[PDB]
């Protein structure tokens, strides 16, 4: 059969990024769980680009229709967020936003 044993992916992680974009601390647990892929923790950027592109590739729509000219607002969106987490210290220490 070769059928592999893969409940979540990618794609479920995209919700999941909807809800812990709120109450994020470091995207550990989608990491963890994004796919099976990242189970290992490789590299702060590497997971960093994987992440980036998963929400990126989403709906930020960063062809503005136009065309390719330079996607910095991905990265800026991307680092504003984690930031955020960890300079929001859970707001009150708790998950209870």
Same mark, same amino acid.
């Given at each position: 059969?070769?059928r592999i044993?893969? !409940?979540?992916?990618?794609?479920?992680v995209?919700?999941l @990024?909807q809800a812990?974009?709120?109450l994020?601390?470091?995207?550990?647990r989608?990491?963890?769980?994004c $796919?099976?892929e990242? $189970?290992?923790?490789?590299? *702060?950027?590497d997971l960093?680009?994987?992440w980036?592109?998963?929400?990126?590739? $989403?709906?930020?729509? !960063?062809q503005?229709r136009?065309?390719?000219p330079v !996607?910095?607002?991905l990265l800026?969106r @991307?680092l504003?967020?984690?930031? *955020?987490w960890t300079? =929001?210290?859970?707001?009150?220490? =708790?998950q209870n936003?």
């Amino acid at each position: 059969q070769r059928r592999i044993r893969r !409940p979540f992916s990618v794609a479920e992680v995209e919700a999941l @990024v909807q809800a812990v974009e709120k109450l994020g601390t470091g995207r550990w647990r989608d990491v963890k769980l994004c $796919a099976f892929e990242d $189970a290992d923790h490789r590299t *702060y950027v590497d997971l960093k680009d994987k992440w980036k592109t998963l929400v990126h590739t $989403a709906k930020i729509s !960063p062809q503005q229709r136009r065309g390719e000219p330079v !996607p910095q607002e991905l990265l800026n969106r @991307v680092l504003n967020a984690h930031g *955020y987490w960890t300079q =929001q210290q859970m707001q009150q220490l =708790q998950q209870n936003v």
